[PDB]
Amino acid sequence: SSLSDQLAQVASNNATVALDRKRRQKLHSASLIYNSKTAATQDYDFIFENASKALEELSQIEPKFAIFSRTLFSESSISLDRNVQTKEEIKDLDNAINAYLLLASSKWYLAPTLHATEWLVRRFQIHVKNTEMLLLSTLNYYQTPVFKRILSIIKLPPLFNCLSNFVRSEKPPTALTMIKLFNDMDFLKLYTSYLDQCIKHNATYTNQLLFTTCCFINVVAFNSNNDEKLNQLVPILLEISAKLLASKSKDCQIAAHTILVVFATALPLKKTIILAAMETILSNLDAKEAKHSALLTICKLFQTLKGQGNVDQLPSKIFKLFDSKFDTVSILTFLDKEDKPVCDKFITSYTRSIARYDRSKLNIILSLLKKIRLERYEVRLIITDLIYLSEILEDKSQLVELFEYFISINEDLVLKCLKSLGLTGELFEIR
Amino acid sequence: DEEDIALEFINGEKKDKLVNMNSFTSMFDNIQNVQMDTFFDRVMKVLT
Amino acid sequence: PKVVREAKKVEMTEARAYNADADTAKAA
Amino acid sequence: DSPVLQSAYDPSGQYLCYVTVALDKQRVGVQPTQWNENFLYLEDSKLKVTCLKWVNDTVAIILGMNNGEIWLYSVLANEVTYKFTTGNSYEIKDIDLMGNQLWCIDSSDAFYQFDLLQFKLLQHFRINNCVQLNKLTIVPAGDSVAQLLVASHSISLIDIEEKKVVMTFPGHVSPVSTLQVITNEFFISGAEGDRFLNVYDIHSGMTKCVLVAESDIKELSHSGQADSIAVTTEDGSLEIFVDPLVSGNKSKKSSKKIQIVSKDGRKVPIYNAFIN
Amino acid sequence: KNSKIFSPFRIIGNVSNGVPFATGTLGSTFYIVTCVGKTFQIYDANTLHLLFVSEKETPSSIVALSAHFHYVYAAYENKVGIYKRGIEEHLLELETDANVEHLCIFGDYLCASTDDNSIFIYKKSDPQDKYPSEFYTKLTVTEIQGGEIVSLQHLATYLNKLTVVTKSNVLLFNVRTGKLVFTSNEFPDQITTAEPAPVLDIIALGTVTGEVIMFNMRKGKRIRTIKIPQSRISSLSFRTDGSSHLSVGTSSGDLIFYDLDRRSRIHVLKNIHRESYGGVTQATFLNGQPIIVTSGGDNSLKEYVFDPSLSQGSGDVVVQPPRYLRSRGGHSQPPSYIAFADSQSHFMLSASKDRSLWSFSLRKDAQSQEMSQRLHKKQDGGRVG
Amino acid sequence: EAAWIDSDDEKIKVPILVTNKTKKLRTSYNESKINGVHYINRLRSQFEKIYPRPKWVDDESDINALTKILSTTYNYKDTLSNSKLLPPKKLDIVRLKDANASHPSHSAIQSLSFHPSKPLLLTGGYDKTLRIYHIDGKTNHLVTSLHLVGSPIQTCTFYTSLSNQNQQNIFTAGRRRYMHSWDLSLTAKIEKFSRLYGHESTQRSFENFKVAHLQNSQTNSVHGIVLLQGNNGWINILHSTSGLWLMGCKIEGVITDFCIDYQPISRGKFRTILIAVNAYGEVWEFDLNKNGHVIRRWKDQGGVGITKIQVGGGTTTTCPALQISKIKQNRWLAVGSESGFVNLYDRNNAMTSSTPTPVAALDQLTTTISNLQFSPDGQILCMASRAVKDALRLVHLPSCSVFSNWPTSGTPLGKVTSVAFSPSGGLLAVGNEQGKVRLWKLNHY
RNA sequence: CAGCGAAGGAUUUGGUGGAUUACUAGCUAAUAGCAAUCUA
């Protein structure tokens, strides 16, 4: 290309190294704490000693920082220069920095981590070189003067380009701009990589997960009326949904339930992928809040299923697994909940599966059929499966009790299912 | 009776509530210091 | 301002390839 | 344009079987030629009649649909009796039968053998060096189940046992739309779009005559001994050539022309004639 | 027939036909040898100009071609022609009437295979001359040993071995002693593509159901399997610039880029080539290059470049989707009507049965470009119908 | 570790320094001919430094199934196969041939109907020439074209008897004081109903009528009814075969419109209800298989002058049944105003209310509405004005969301004055004032 | 205001790619080697 941009490239390459006094002070004056004319007279040992004090108090409030004392906040670290050593030890350096940054992603409400990280900024120059992990680790606190400060001193990466009119503006960046930051899969694959590192370090927490989930449902909201964009956007959100369920935290599990429920009501998925999602959210379900939320999200997932085969049998290994994680009386009291969420298609598939893969305890199906109301094709398919069951195994008092209940309400349904299969005289013969 | 059972099949569907691009902007007002289960209940009540 | 999705002049760098000539032999 | 999608006469010219479309569903109607109201409907819009032929002898149509089925359809019992499947879900392009044995030709260029007395698939073969293929005709020499004549865009000839091309012909610049044998040695070809039928010898391959219509051909009937060929033009007129194989020594013109105009100054376009 | 006024010259405006092309390197250049019906053509890959053509046609149509450094090995009805700079330098008549199907070049031993699982391998008279000129031996795979052949190649770092890929089995050879060495396991469906990997001694092989097996021939096992629903696979390749990327090409006109380090679809490409003309006939990475050369059966050759990543820290996880780069095409159906544009006999116009209009240039064959159907807007207020 | 041993390469020797490219993999300056397996290992390391060895080969050797199915498939929507219903907010229209194009019309298109089973469209306008087309997706022609002088027709429709289905009577009416019936028999015999038996002082016009079946309910003489409008509050129900005044019903306030809702009673019995509105917008819902006396009455939530009421979902005028057992209870009601606000009501809970709240009260088209009709299956609502161009909207329901993708501004609707559906085909037909009727179809049906 | 009028119309502008001369492949120490290397 041309000469001007051809060496603007090498200027951006060697922006980290100070070449004289003017660029040295224009590089040293970046700070998370002090302003320019104060920060231009600090030395390294001063900010190092107050940062080490900040670190040791931060390490007694969180016991996983003495390793960074031993290897990154040591006394030789003030002499360790970054851009004087080879690519392999700079790779060691910035993955250690990334470890520290995701570890200290939580603590940004309290000033010890500000004074702990400001020496890291001033010495290892993460505000120019290691900028990405810094931004998308502290992205949760976007209404805070720490984020306004760090965005005022940052050099802005090519991904976060929507924020470049929020540098040195007193207005914090707004939620709409955060959505427009999140609204391309070049950013989203990056952010899912970061969340994968947070999962496999268990550095997840209730505020980062809340913010992440809220921006993801807002991204799906903006891509509601773009079918090609939504189908383009599936295999990353569902990917970290499945990676989010693999962890142990109740909060990330119910965040996975949140993105799953909003995505299922966003677009109609297929039966095989929604069944894999159902068994996946069941296969790592431990805490009671996760039980409650997973039951709600399973019911809504199955409610947003259309086309034929919607109310069919869930198979045996997902059915017994659902019964292993959820006993029948939990289903009964959830149906006894007074809010009455619409769960008719899931309860229809549950009735057909308990009548086909257990065929033993029909007090359950009679009780919950009394407890909810249910629509006509659902009860037609239930009583068809009941006709087949009543002819394969011999009739019982429970079976004929629910049968005469379906006599007592809406006779011509079971009459027309007998017209499809036999005759009411033959059914009274099998009575 | 096949179109009759098809017509009953399409009759047996209630009013869902769709999503649209300005339905979830209100969550950002109370993303602060809120337990995620209450967030899940909030997004489900704004959803249905 | 959107993210600058921007192309560039592309250039074919140096090849570096195994060749099959050293894969045969002969009885001596 | 004609609201009849396609039509075909029974042999000896007494009945017409015609496929029309009626509220995005094709239906097949039969009609005698001196009311009948047994419209066989089709199921859905993704299922339309590509080609059809009478049989002769419980009276029946066979209808090649556009998915890989041949609906052998009786006319008396107003339903499809038998459903000749193929292995592929490919739309067929022509059917032709002789006695028991029946040939079908796919869009994936395969040739299919069927037998309407025993309802099996006998054999199944694609061949090289002929790709766009849309209609065939079995060449009769009594019981010549071998040597059928395949045609699109350059007419080929196929023995069914050596299974190679035995003789190619100068086709047309368009795909072939009519391919009718007329004697034991001559056959009419005619493409779509063009006014120019041509009789080819089936042994030497030399064009004997070129029949010149005055508009685009749509269909044609011929007498049993090829002494008279009536074609129906695209603009609804009719051109009947008398004695086409006797010699205007190379390109025979239209001998007689028939149109059906009303007394109101309105021409109604005829189509699908039949001459015995 | 021969003539006495007009002599035929060249069939212009024609790029590919559907035969899998080949590629060759010269220094740090790349040339693409594609087939057009009977003659072939040699493009370069940097600016995608034409460079060479065969100086005279073949008897039959070319069924298979490959390319070493300077030389192009064409293969038609019974022979293999060793060519240099588009000029035929040596015929090689095979010792049969059987039609040749595939071939490979490695070291000294050329190896071609007919349509009855018979493999003529040839050898250079002097281990210093330029091309294999002398018949060495004739292997023959029998139906006990596997199915009927579908490819063959010598994957790397193998001392005078070879890999024949059948429809049911993989089977090696030691081509010096003419010996089979290792038949592989059984494979339960028809495989149709096999391309080697730039990692040590494994070969990726894709089936008629959409799975890619990765056979490790030294181990004799399979390492991984990429499953894909009901895709008639056609052409695999690997990317060799360090960052490992597999690339499958499905005959439904699809091009799927798989990562292999984390088994993820990087990006799909839909309807890149037309479905009905064969789909992706052959697609390959240029080695040491982050570009893709695809060619369909629909008279089109394309190049797709992978951009550098936008995540300067993350890097290999965030991969930018492939751009579109240079491409050369003609219309894919026989041309209906033909005119000459200028008096200088430089430009000519075609309009084809696939309803496209092209301005071919018979002077220099990178100037030919399609005319564009973008309506001038009605500046009186009307709307385009 | 190798599953095979070549047993030939170990007895080979190669002088590696014969050429340039094979002389760098020496290790001393005195070694010339090396053994075969050593040679294999040397060039194998040369290959591994000429392309590095990545991790995915030495990874492995082939709560998970979500990742597995997600890495399997591409199209993440089930709607390719069955779909059984509509997709909301984006429908699959296509265009067909303009249904007036064979034999055009001259006046507006004030009425447009379909034969209930046969593939026939009827067109009727103020130029007093009721035409009938045979319609199809390619080229659709005129079967017959009755003209009748001195009677500019306003509304006209097909009718078949429920009992023996072989009647096929057109009914047509305009601003005059006579209407016409027609038994269609492929030269026509038409009768002119003008005998008003009971009430003769309430019709300045016949220009609004419906046709509806009813049962006898002591016998089963299922037969037709013409329902004509009057002037004060009068709507008169006649006979369709004979022409006898069956009875009449007056509501309080000026009639604006009315509709007919059937409901089954047993296997072979059914009951008809007439729904009528004011301009004020309090409706009367009275059965008329017994004598016409009000069995329900309630009030629309709003409207100053409401213009058009249409019931749908089950069977109705536009989607009629053929066998008597094939008749179905409706689901949706719709009421439309001069302000444009169309309320749509469910009728599975709102037989109990006596003041029902709307399911939705939509407003997208601004001006007054003129025609609104449901689908034959009750998933599309179709609303249209007679005031401005492109004044038609389509509403997916039960979700009650307007379709966004259609109609755009570039659709050639014209100033719409009538609209109708197919009974089965999902083939929609719109008519304007400048003469042409255009034809679309819905690809889900 | 009108009409034109297939699930939008009409404009501003960046970047890349292809042309703007007539298409015989790259490098070097060049009757050859290289393309993994010109070194002993």
Side-chain angles (χ1 to χ4, degrees), chain A residues 142 175 210 214 217-218 221-222 225 250-251 254 258 262 289 292-293 300 307 310 344-345 375-377 380, chain B residues 5 8-9 12-14 17 19-21 24-25 27-28 31 34-37 39-41 43-44 47-48:
Chain A
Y142 73 100
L210 183 41
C214 172
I217 75 170
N218 274 97
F222 279 6
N225 42 2
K250 45 175 285 294
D251 293 278
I254 67 190
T258 307
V262 67
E289 307 90 342
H292 155 80
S293 79
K300 190 64 179 177
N310 54 359
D344 68 272
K345 296 183 183 181
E375 227 276 335
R376 195 163 183 268
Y377 67 91
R380 160 164 315 200
Chain B
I5 67 178
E8 187 265 305
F9 181 81
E13 180 46 83
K14 290 177 288 297
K17 191 162 300 310
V19 287
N20 41 357
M21 64 185 74
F24 291 128
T25 44
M27 304 288 115
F28 284 108
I31 43 165
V34 159
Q35 187 57 46
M36 265 289 305
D37 192 301
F39 181 72
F40 181 77
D41 293 338
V43 63
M44 285 218 72
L47 187 60
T48 84

Side-chain angles (χ1 to χ4, degrees), chain F residues 107 122-132 144-157 170-182 188-193 206 209:
Chain F
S107 88
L122 203 148
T123 313
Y126 280 166
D127 42 16
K128 66 201 59 52
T129 169
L130 56 98
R131 310 173 158 88
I132 173 169
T144 90
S145 68
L146 199 146
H147 176 87
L148 72 166
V149 300
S151 169
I153 71 172
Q154 165 63 247
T155 186
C156 44
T157 182
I170 318 291
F171 293 93
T172 173
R175 218 189 266 273
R176 316 300 201 154
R177 296 152 257 196
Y178 44 86
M179 70 178 289
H180 307 261
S181 169
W182 179 10
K189 41 169 181 289
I190 65 179
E191 310 154 354
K192 184 213 296 204
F193 285 169
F206 280 168
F209 76 98

